[PDB]
Design a protein around this ligand. Structure first.
Ligand SMILES: [Cl-]
Ligand SMILES: [Mg+2]
Lengths: 198, 233, 243, 242, 241, 244, 244, 250, 111
């Protein structure tokens, strides 16, 4: 479907998300940001069913932002992912479940360590050095199994994504119109505006 | 005595009285006078509309319930609106389900039973309004008197409100005359205007002051206000 | 402060006045009833008083057939008596359906007593101003008398009495069981157990009874039944040919 | 104690009559209906000079053809305005037309008697009546320019002119003499502004008093402080003329 | 189940439960708010019935409803929490649906509506709380300051105080705050706030806490020293005369 | 109707006070004294057992010191039955937070929730408040060692040292006198016992009339440890401090 | 103390319910109504006070039918009586729906009995301000009942309630003595007319209208019917003859 | 209809007293004397069968009730209140424990559940507190033998020995003299019978005394054999004969 | 399995003049290949100078017409006998029909 990639390096988590939104035989938009900032040091990318995808993301964002103001404190990436998993684990046995898959990339300011969580629509959470949702994984996991090191810089991490995107652009049937890349580190969340040709 | 047994409608007095009900009946006597009278062919409502200031309107006293039934109020207007709205629905239910115009006698029975439920349960209050229902059904012309107590009575004529005893004595005397005004609506209304004018004292019934309704053989329930009642003053 | 006598809450002395006043209502009818156990039967006698000549004597009863096996005599006003009767009948029917055997006398007694206890603790429910005397020949315990009151108290009896002149009938029966050294009427036929119950009713109250002054219920193995005026007359003729 | 929906021996609801006493302690509100439009005027009555006067909202829009002024416990009005605005827009959705001023007023008054501790009728879950009276002014194609007085009793009267609040009985006696069937809109503006000046404890200026009107053409508009200031200047000149 | 009408009209047209709710506010610790040309300041006094408190963890008097709006109060501390929570939830609900933070007017109008609802709902008493809500509307530099009271009435103030001895500190502000020239600096805006509290607090370095809110979600709470410096400079204004 | 018998537990006095809250605090003023003292390297909870007998089994007894969390405990003052209702709900809230976030509940969040439940019985429902005052002794990785108090009003505050129940006025004066910010747990244990010993309404302060608990971060571990003292352990520390 | 009569379900120290006894006063205040049990049926009659000439003769009917075989007449608060018959009709319909057979009179009696008794169990309801005389013909003979506000009812040979119940009861007692073999339906209608005319003397100030109904196995096929035209006049004349 | 009593009938008085709880404790004091003594190898609970009439059968009224096969209960105060508490106590042992963990609750937890029911009658709308004090004696594998008192307030305390009702003050004093931490179960029954003799006015025999023990497992009372782990109930009610045997060695 | 819908056939025709309007319909009612009635009126005068016809499933057609006729009656009661304009009737019928969006009236309706 939509491409949702996440990669955790030495001192950051990098999230790459496809810009294409398609209904039928038409590409309605080629600049869609498939991610919401939950807190200044936690970012969540998402893909799945048309309506559920954003509705769920904004709902989670609303709850984390409410907690942030109530406690005047930022929840750990671990804590946020555990909240999200439980919401999906409830959803799966409800009348109409949220059909949404999420990556949660966050910098834990307490531990001073980047953290990447992969959660599917069933509420199946797992912490990974690198993650993908849908058909992306089928090509990217073997790539990263080969080229990934834990001591890689953010610059090395972007080069490793560029390599993943190139492979998906070569062997994947659908035009996903490139990716929006966002780095999560100790200084918060910034967007790499120059990934069109880095 | 009375002070201890008038706190709510759920309490009987030692003499076997319901003071909350009697207090509701008092709200009627304070209300503006309205008169009802029927022949064999037609039934007429004549109501004296009351104004707050000379700058205010004269509050409407007659409400249409169906094409063959309507009523005049005396007391709390909102309670008249609730009961009239309920009676509208019962007339409406009878039409849709049974294709049957609701008998005036059965309309009375329903108002009686609805008023009663407010007099036996805690938290509730009695209705603070008296109603004169007129209608032409399958058994000719009808006039009913409704009391918040739940007591409904079929009469040839009557009056309720302030100084209502004046009109009621007149009708009790004119009985043999007006009962026979058959196939003449104008004469039955004139006999109703002569009835209500027996309960005047303050002013004389003017154009935007008088309110008259009529139902009968080949007359749907229609309300006459203003210019339209000028030929009866 | 002074409303501790209007609803079922504790008074400073640790008392429930509404329960005590409910007990007072039980004597409003001015009727005396006693129950005695035979060798294989249980008999209930109750005074039958018909003041109005316009009343239908056949309809005036404070004895009720709860089930095939259980009979219940009430001391108190008839509206509360009939409230308790219908509930007991409903509980006896439901028990049989759910558990597949006839409700025992003592279990219905406990159940009705537990209901009375709830009115003793919940404010919106008043106690019923009645004393319920349940009788049967239980298929486990044999002849059985179990009595409940507005407090929610219940217990089994060898014999019992209820009403205004309860104490006189009680002490009369006490003295008989001190003498006989047994906890029942040693008699094979129920007719003679009914005759005993009427005899000691007369002795204690000091009043003679016609056929229309009494009301009798008998419990046997697999049936409870009430006597007709003529069944009582036959009983009154038997006791007459001994005095 | 004693029921909230209890009748007095004189056949009146205690809580309703006590509610009317609360309204007498409220700020003055005046309505005048003419063939050129209906004017609504209120006393702001700021409790301190530090209170930013223009934040006092005692005249509110219900629809483009219906406005209303309030007097008494103004906090109670919020849910009444909300129901009125909803009723007007809901009616437009169902019938593709403006709601009749009388029908809108009748809908607001239907709330008034929905108080009790569980009264046998429907489900009136509200502990007390409203502590506010509304002057509902509007226009429709059927009955033209209309002014209504909505009480917490559930009764509503149509007035050619009406005053509610602290200075009501005084202002009403003034409106009795001054009102005629052929008043212009400008005449009605000065007249509201004059009667407010008379009953207000404070000296009337463009900060402690607010005007508004409803005309068939431009609908319901609240007068800005500059426009009201000139009408005050115009009033003083005409009073000083004789 | 419980729907007993606690807030009802009395013969003289008063709701005593709402009236007595204001008495709970009068009892509460003094809170003040003054708005400058480019800032709003919220000052609150601390009690001294018991002094052995951990000032790190003890709930502070000025609460953030959003990153751009703050709420101080006077009255029952327990009651204030229930209003603050409902406001914080509504702030996020507004952002989620309108895609824009609440205006200070909207957030006030909501909190006011809640307080009002508890004055004519069955089986509830009114809130024993008056609030000062202050901040800046999204992408706006015009300072905002509103007050609510248990009745449900609300309005905006150039400067206002609530709680115990609010009568005194209001009198001070009325003859010290010029609408022609509001405190043009953050500094002289805080100075006027502390000055107004010192009328009531009676020598309180640790008994006065100040919160400054500037445009674009710029909210900071002053430390003991920073406030103690203002107290030192103000006491010299008196002694130099 | 039923209106006749309604106490109206959630109304204001003409002065703007909550009758039932004020009378509930009066109830608590007669309950056995409980003291909390926060040190640099831990927290102490000490409580005086109200009414005892030779035949009261002290070994299986707990009426004042309850464990909410592995990192949070409470000292009770008032109705034990009322306290056990609130303790049970507080234990559940702590587990709901852990299940949701996979992190132990911060102390204030638990305290605020319990305080918000008490506030509920104060504003609606027409029920009597809980005749209970709590001292919360807890540790989390945000604020470290924390000491809170909550009362029937639903109001809570944080303390360096505090007392609830009987003779708080006297107890608070003695704590405010001998407390220093750089205190150690062993110093706090002594202070707590000294304070109770002088505020006790009984002859002597014996072991059989005391409940004791400490929340320390045992240096030879790096994790927080709750220690609810056994009768023999209270008897020991009572002799060492010089009360025998 | 006192105040035992202000709430419905409250027992007074002498085990009485004063609110029920106050409801009886509302009944005693009301019009007189009777019932006569004949050899194969029952006859119901009631006094209708003519307030004025304005009352339409023969129109304001008071006697109500339940199902097709039961007649009901009441004295006191007429609305309360209507509310009881409304319930009775729902109760009779419920029975027939499940059991097919029309409700027996004893069965129907207890159904009204339990409902009226229920309005003496709670302070949130008022007792019924009517004594109801009802009955008809079923499987095994005719039955006449009278139901008091307490919920108390019995079977009757003759029954009377309201203003002139003593006059009625006295005249009924004479019939029971002088007809031990049983009165006929025809005779009971004439006799009922007389007793109403004789019992009217306790209200002789206001002119009245007579209303009779009957349920006879031989005369109405065991269905409740109103006495009309010739048979009504024949009964009025029998009474008007024997009043002089 | 409908319970419109949704408000508390127990409220704090200006003195800080809860009236209805204090008045409930007064009702308990009027009740017949009942006691409990804990031995090293068992617990005994005893009360007097105050027959309301000599015609009444005292056997058909159990003041001492089995809650679980290892837990027993006795009371002082209002009998009906006790009867419904026993019914609720037996059910809550199943619904809240046995139907979850597949074993009967330990004494302290079942006591805790009874305590909660009685606390709710102190705070819930339109109810009065229970007019009884319970003495609950029980055994469980990890706590051994235990004896608890439960008051109308909902408060409960563990006891070595105690008494409640009429002559509790005098009975508690006599137990303080005779109790040691080395008592055998037979010694505790003997002390229980001595203590209860001071309370009883009239006849003192097996037909007027109701006494039960929490002791050794009774495999003869289990009703089935073949499951080694199931050894039978520790609760046993002493017979009329068994009491009279120990009364001759008084 | 029970089918709630049926087809009673028939056809309706509406034409608007400059100062008039016509709503015509055949009087035939059918089921499958059988004729139910040769004269069963389908176009109705609803008052306020409005004529209405709901053609398709006769049961759903009669039900809708009946509810709209009732809607006109309650418009008079609630708005001081005001005449329901044709545009106002149209919007009212939209709400009547869309009310049963998930169990529709199987009719094509013309006013
Ligand atoms: Cl049970
Ligand atoms: Mg997964």
């Amino acid at each position: 479907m939509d491409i949702i990639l996440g990669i955790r390096v030495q001192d950051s988590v990098i999230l790459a998300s496809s810009k294409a939104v398609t209904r039928g035989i038409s590409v309605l938009k080629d600049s869609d940001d498939k991610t919401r900032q939950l807190s200044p040091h936690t970012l969540m990318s998402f893909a799945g069913e048309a309506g559920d995808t954003v509705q769920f993301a904004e709902y989670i964002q609303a709850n984390i932002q409410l907690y942030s103001i109530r406690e005047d404190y930022e929840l750990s990436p671990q804590a946020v992912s555990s909240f999200v998993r439980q919401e999906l684990a409830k959803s799966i046995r409800s009348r109409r479940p949220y059909q949404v898959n999420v990556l949660i990339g966050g910098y834990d300011k307490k531990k001073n360590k980047p953290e990447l969580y992969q959660i599917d629509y069933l509420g199946t959470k797992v912490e990974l050095p690198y993650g993908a949702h849908g058909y992306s994984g089928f090509y990217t996991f073997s790539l990263l199994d080969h080229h990934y090191r834990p001591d890689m810089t953010t610059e090395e991490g972007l080069d490793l994504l560029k390599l993943c995107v190139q492979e998906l652009e070569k062997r994947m049937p659908m035009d996903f119109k490139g990716v929006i890349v966002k780095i999560v580190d100790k200084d918060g969340i910034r967007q790499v505006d120059d990934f069109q040709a880095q | 005595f009375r002070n201890n047994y008038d706190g709510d409608t759920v309490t009987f007095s030692p003499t076997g009285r319901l003071f909350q009900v009697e207090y509701a009946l008092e709200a009627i006597k304070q209300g503006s006078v309205t008169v009802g009278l029927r022949s064999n062919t037609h039934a007429v409502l004549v109501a004296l509309k009351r104004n707050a200031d000379e700058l205010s309107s004269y509050q409407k006293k007659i409400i249409k319930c169906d094409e063959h039934m309507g009523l005049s109020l005396a007391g709390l207007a909102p309670d008249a609106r609730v009961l009239s709205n309920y009676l509208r629905q019962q007339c409406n239910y009878s039409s849709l389900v049974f294709n049957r115009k609701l008998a005036v006698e059965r309309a009375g029975h329903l108002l009686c039973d609805k008023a009663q439920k407010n007099t036996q349960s805690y938290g509730g209050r009695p209705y603070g309004v008296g109603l004169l229902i007129i209608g032409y059904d399958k058994s000719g012309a009808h006039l009913l008197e409704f009391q918040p107590s739940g007591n409904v009575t079929e009469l040839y004529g009557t009056a309720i409100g302030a100084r209502s005893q004046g009109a009621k004595t007149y009708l009790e005397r004119t009985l043999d005359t007006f009962i026979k005004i058959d196939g003449n609506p104008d004469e039955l209304i004139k006999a109703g205007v002569e009835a209500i004018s027996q309960s005047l004292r303050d002013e004389s019934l003017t154009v935007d002051n008088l309110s008259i309704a009529i139902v009968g053989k080949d007359t749907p329930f229609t309300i006459y206000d203003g210019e339209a009642v000028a030929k009866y003053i | 402060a002074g409303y501790d006598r209007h609803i079922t809450i504790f008074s400073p002395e640790g008392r429930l006045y509404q329960v005590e006043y409910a007990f007072k209502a039980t004597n409003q009818t001015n009727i005396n009833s006693l129950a005695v156990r035979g060798k294989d039967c249980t008999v209930v006698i109750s005074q039958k008083k018909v003041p109005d000549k316009l009343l239908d004597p056949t309809t005036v009863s404070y004895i009720f057939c709860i089930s095939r096996t259980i009979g219940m005599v009430v001391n108190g006003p008839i509206p509360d008596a009939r409230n308790a009767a219908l509930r007991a009948k409903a509980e006896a029917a439901e028990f049989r359906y759910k558990y597949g055997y006839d409700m025992p006398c003592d279990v219905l007694a406990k159940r009705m007593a537990n209901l009375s206890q709830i009115y003793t603790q919940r404010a919106y429910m008043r106690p019923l101003g009645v004393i319920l005397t349940f009788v049967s020949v239980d298929e486990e315990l044999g002849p059985s008398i179990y009595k409940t009151d507005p407090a929610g108290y219940y217990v089994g009896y060898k014999a019992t009495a209820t009403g205004p002149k309860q104490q006189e009938i009680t002490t009369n029966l006490e003295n008989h069981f001190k003498k006989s050294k047994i906890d029942h009427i040693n008699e094979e036929s129920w007719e003679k157990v009914v005759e005993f119950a009427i005899t000691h009713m007369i002795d204690a109250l000091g009043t003679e009874f016609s056929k229309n002054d009494l009301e009798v219920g008998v419990a046997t193995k697999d049936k409870f039944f009430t006597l007709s005026a003529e069944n009582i007359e036959e009983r009154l003729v038997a006791i007459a040919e001994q005095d | 104690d004693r029921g909230v929906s209890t009748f007095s021996p004189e056949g009146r609801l205690f809580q309703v009559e006590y509610s009317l006493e609360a309204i007498k302690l409220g700020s003055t509100a005046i309505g005048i209906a003419t063939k050129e439009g209906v004017v609504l005027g209120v006393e702001k009555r700021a409790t301190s000079p530090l209170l930013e006067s223009d934040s006092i909202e005692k005249i509110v829009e219900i629809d483009r053809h219906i406005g209303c002024a309030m007097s008494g416990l103004t906090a109670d009005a919020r849910s009444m305005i909300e129901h009125a605005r909803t009723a007007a827009v809901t009616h437009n959705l169902y019938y593709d037309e403006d709601i009749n001023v009388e029908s809108l007023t009748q809908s607001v008054c239907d709330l008034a008697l929905r108080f009790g501790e569980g009264a046998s009728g429907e489900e009136r879950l509200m502990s007390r009546p409203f502590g506010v009276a509304l002057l509902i002014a509007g226009h429709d194609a059927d009955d033209g320019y209309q002014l209504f007085h909505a009480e917490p009793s559930g009764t509503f009267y149509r007035y050619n002119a009406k005053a509610i609040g602290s200075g009501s009985e005084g202002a009403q006696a003034e409106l009795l003499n001054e009102w005629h069937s052929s008043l212009t809109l400008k005449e009605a503006e000065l007249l509201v502004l004059k009667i407010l000046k008379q009953v207000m404890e404070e000296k009337l200026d463009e900060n402690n008093a607010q005007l508004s009107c409803i005309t068939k053409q431009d609908g319901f508009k609240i007068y800005d402080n500059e426009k009201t200031a000139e009408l005050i200047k115009e009033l003083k000149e005409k009073e000083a003329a004789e | 189940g419980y729907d007993r009408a606690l807030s009802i009209f009395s013969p003289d047209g008063h709701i005593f439960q709402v009236e007595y709710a204001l008495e709970a506010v009068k009892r509460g610790t003094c809170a003040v708010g003054v708005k400058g040309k480019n800032c709003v300041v919220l000052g609150c006094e601390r009690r001294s019935t018991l002094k052995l408190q951990d000032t790190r963890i003890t709930p502070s008097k000025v609460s953030k409803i959003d990153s751009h709006v703050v709420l101080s109060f006077s009255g029952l501390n327990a009651d204030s929490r229930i209003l603050i929570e409902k406001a914080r939830v509504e702030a996020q609900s507004h952002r989620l649906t309108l895609e824009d933070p609440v205006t200070v007017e909207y957030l006030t109008r909501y909190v006011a509506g809640v307080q009002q609802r508890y004055t004519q709902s069955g089986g509830v008493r009114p809130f024993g709380v008056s609030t000062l809500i202050a901040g800046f509307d999204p992408r706006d530099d015009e300072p905002k300051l509103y007050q609510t009271e248990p009745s449900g009435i609300y309005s905006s103030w150039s400067a206002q105080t609530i709680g115990r001895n609010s009568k005194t500190v209001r009198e001070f502000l009325e003859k010290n705050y010029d609408r022609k020239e509001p405190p043009a600096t953050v500094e002289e805006c805080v100075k006027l706030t502390v000055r107004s509290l010192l009328e009531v607090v009676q020598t309180g370095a640790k008994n006065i806490e100040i919160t400054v809110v500037k445009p674009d979600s710029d909210i900071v709470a002053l430390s003991s020293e920073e406030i103690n410096q203002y107290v030192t400079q103000i006491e010299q204004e008196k002694q130099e005369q | 109707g039923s209106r006749r018998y309604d106490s109206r537990t959630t109304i204001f006095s003409p002065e703007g006070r909550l009758y039932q809250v004020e009378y509930a605090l009066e109830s608590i003023s007669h309950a056995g004294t409980a003291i909390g003292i926060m040190a640099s390297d831990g927290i102490v909870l000490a409580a005086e057992r109200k009414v005892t007998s030779t035949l009261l089994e002290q070994d299986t007894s707990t009426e004042k010191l309850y464990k909410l969390n592995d990192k949070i405990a409470v000292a009770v003052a008032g109705l034990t039955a009322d306290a056990e209702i609130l303790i049970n709900t507080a234990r559940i809230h702590a587990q709901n937070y852990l299940k949701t976030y996979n992190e132990d509940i911060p102390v204030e969040i638990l305290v605020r929730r319990l305080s918000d439940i008490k506030q509920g019985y104060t504003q609606h429902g027409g029920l009597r408040p809980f005749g209970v005052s709590f001292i919360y002794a807890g540790y989390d990785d945000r604020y470290g060692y924390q000491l809170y108090t909550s009362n029937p009003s639903g109001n809570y505050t944080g303390w360096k040292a505090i007392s609830v129940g009987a003779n708080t006025s006297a107890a608070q004066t003695l704590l405010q006198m001998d407390y220093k910010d750089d205190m150690k747990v062993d110093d706090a244990i002594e202070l707590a016992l000294k304070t109770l010993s002088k505020t006790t309404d009984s002859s002597a302060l014996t072991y059989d009339r005391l409940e004791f608990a400490t929340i320390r971060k045992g240096a030879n571990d790096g994790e927080v440890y709750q220690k609810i003292f056994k009768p023999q352990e209270i008897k020991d520390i009572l002799v060492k401090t010089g009360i025998t | 103390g006192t105040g035992y009569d202000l709430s419905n379900s409250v027992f007074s120290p002498d085990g009485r319910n004063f609110q029920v006894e106050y409801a009886v006063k509302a009944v005693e205040n009301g019009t007189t109504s009777i019932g006569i049990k004949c050899n194969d049926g029952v006859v119901f009659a009631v006094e209708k006070l003519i307030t004025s000439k304005l009352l339409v003769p023969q129109k304001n009917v008071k006697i109500q039918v339940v199902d097709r075989h039961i007649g009901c007449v009441y004295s006191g608060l007429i609305p309360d009586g209507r509310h009881l018959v409304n319930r009775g009709r729902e109760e009779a319909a419920s029975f027939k729906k499940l059991y097919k057979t029309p409700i027996p009179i004893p069965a129907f009696a207890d159904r009204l009995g339990q409902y009226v008794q229920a309005h003496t169990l709670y302070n949130s309801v008022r007792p019924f301000g009517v004594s109801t005389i009802f009955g008809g013909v079923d499987k095994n003979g005719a039955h006449l009942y009278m139901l008091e506000p307490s919920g108390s009812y019995w079977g009757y040979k003759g029954a009377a309630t309201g203003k002139g119940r003593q006059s009625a009861k006295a005249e009924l007692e004479k019939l029971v003595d002088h007809h031990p073999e049983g009165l006929s339906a025809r005779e009971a209608v004439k006799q009922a007319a007389k007793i109403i005319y004789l019992a009217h003397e306790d209200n002789k100030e206001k002119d009245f209208e007579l209303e009779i109904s009957w349920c006879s196995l031989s005369e109405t096929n065991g269905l409740h019917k109103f006495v009309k035209g010739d048979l009504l006049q024949e009964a009025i004349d029998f009474a008007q003859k024997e009043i002089n | 209809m409908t319970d419109r009593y949704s408000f508390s009938l127990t409220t704090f008085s200006p003195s800080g007293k809860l009236g209805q709880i204090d008045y409930a404790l007064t009702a308990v004091k009027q009740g017949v004397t009942s006691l409990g003594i804990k031995a090293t190898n068992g617990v005994v609970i005893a009360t007097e069968k105050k027959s309301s009439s000599p015609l009444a059968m005292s056997e058909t009224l159990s003041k001492v009730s089995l809650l679980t096969p290892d837990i027993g209960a006795v009371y002082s105060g209002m009998g009906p209140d006790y009867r419904v508490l026993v019914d609720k106590s037996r059910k809550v042992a199943h619904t809240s424990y046995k139907r979850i963990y597949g074993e009967y609750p330990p004494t302290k937890l079942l006591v805790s559940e009874v305590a909660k029911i009685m606390q709710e009658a102190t705070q819930s709308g339109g109810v009065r507190p229970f007019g009884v004090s319970l003495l609950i004696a029980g055994h469980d594998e990890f706590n051994g033998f235990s004896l608890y008192q439960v008051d109308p307030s909902g408060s409960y305390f563990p006891w070595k020995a105690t008494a409640i009702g009429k002559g509790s003050v005098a009975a508690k004093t006599f137990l303080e003299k005779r109790w040691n931490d080395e008592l055998e179960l037979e010694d505790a029954i003997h002390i229980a019978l001595l203590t209860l003799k001071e309370s009883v006015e009239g006849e003192f025999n097996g037909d007027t005394i109701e006494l039960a023990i929490i002791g050794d497992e009774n495999p003869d009372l289990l009703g089935y054999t073949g499951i080694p782990t199931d050894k039978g109930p520790r609760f046993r009610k002493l017979t009329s004969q068994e009491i009279n045997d120990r009364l001759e060695a008084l | 399995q029970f089918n709630p819908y049926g087809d009673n056939g028939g056809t309706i025709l509406g034409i608007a003049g400059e100062d008039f309007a016509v709503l015509a319909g055949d009087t035939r009612n059918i089921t499958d290949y059988s004729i139910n009635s040769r004269y069963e009126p389908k176009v109705f005068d609803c008052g306020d100078n409005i004529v209405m016809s709901a053609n398709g499933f006769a049961a759903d057609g009669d039900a809708l017409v009946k509810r709209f006729k009732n809607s006109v009656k309650w418009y008079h009661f609630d708005h001081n006998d005001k005449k329901l304009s044709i545009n106002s009737a149209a919007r009212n019928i939209q709400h009547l029909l869309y009310g049963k969006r998930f169990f529709p009236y199987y009719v094509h309706t013309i006013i």
